[PDB]
Design a protein around this ligand. Structure first.
Ligand code: CU
Length: 99
């Protein structure tokens, strides 16, 4: 699955912000517009047994340019919430469900 970081007209969102994949699918977050962005999983909203540090970009790493991306494969079933640090207050938050 592919997720865009920022919308064509600079809007501060994940596109799409709600996705469902199957266990073992790869999500590739691609830097699109409205830089900079990053991807952090919410420690409170992840399936028990998921290690957040293993699955997240460090909160301070940022993608500042086109072509930059972040890939992660999720295996545990259930719902994970994620956000973009710089834009958390702007509502750039999303959610994946692994089936
Ligand atoms: Cu962002």
């Amino acid at each position: 699955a592919e997720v865009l970081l920022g919308s064509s007209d600079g809007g501060l969102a994940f596109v799409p912000s709600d996705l469902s994949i199957a266990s073992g699918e790869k999500i590739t977050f691609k830097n699109n517009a409205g830089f900079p962005h990053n991807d952090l999983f919410d420690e409170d909203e992840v399936p028990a047994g998921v290690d957040v540090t293993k699955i997240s970009m460090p909160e301070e790493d940022l993608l500042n340019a086109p072509g930059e991306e972040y890939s992660v494969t999720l295996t545990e079933k259930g719902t994970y919430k994620f956000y973009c640090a710089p834009h958390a207050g702007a509502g750039m938050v999303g959610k994946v469900t692994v089936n």
